[PDB]
């Protein structure tokens, strides 16, 4: 809807892209791309664990 | 120059933004914003350590 970025956060990205020796756009894509992976695995693990508890309660209730 | 994203990486971002309950654009900014921080601190620490060694060699050489 309304994307929000701080002028002090826009600086961090310009600075970190420089450190990484990449463009601000390549840094943004790269970080979004790898943080997407982290998030996917995190959620995979939480759903898997949610599935173990429902497996235990399935047995215990019977 | 030429930004590159895999069709299989574009999917990960759409999926992870959904998990995070954010737009693909807000997810991208947010992840770039927080990964910029990680990178800044990483480099701060490497420069600080580089400064300790040059401090040791400064003494040892004299
Ligand atoms: Na800052
Ligand atoms: Na500034
Ligand atoms: Na990067
Ligand atoms: Na369990
Ligand atoms: Na994938
Ligand atoms: Na696909
Ligand atoms: Na996020
Ligand atoms: Na040292």
């Amino acid at each position: 809807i309304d994307l929000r970025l701080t002028d002090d956060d826009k600086s961090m990205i310009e600075e970190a892209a420089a450190i990484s020796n990449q463009s601000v756009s390549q840094f943004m894509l790269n970080s979004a791309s790898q943080r997407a992976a982290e998030v996917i695995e995190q959620h995979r693990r939480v759903i898997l664990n949610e599935e173990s508890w429902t497996r235990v309660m399935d047995a215990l209730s019977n």
Side-chain angles (χ1 to χ4, degrees), chain A residues 26-44:
Chain A
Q26 198 50 238
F27 179 81
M28 278 188 50
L29 295 177
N30 281 188
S31 45
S33 166
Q34 61 187 277
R35 165 89 192 300
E38 293 165 24
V39 167
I40 292 308
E41 193 52 36
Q42 159 62 18
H43 182 258
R44 179 197 102 88

Side-chain angles (χ1 to χ4, degrees), chain A residues 15-24 26-49 52-54 56:
Chain A
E15 201 183 357
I19 291 157
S20 309
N21 297 302
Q22 309 189 278
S23 60
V24 175
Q26 198 50 238
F27 179 81
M28 278 188 50
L29 295 177
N30 281 188
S31 45
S33 166
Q34 61 187 277
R35 165 89 192 300
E38 293 165 24
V39 167
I40 292 308
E41 193 52 36
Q42 159 62 18
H43 182 258
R44 179 197 102 88
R45 283 185 271 107
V46 175
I47 291 299
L48 188 147
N49 165 66
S52 301
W53 275 103
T54 180
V56 164

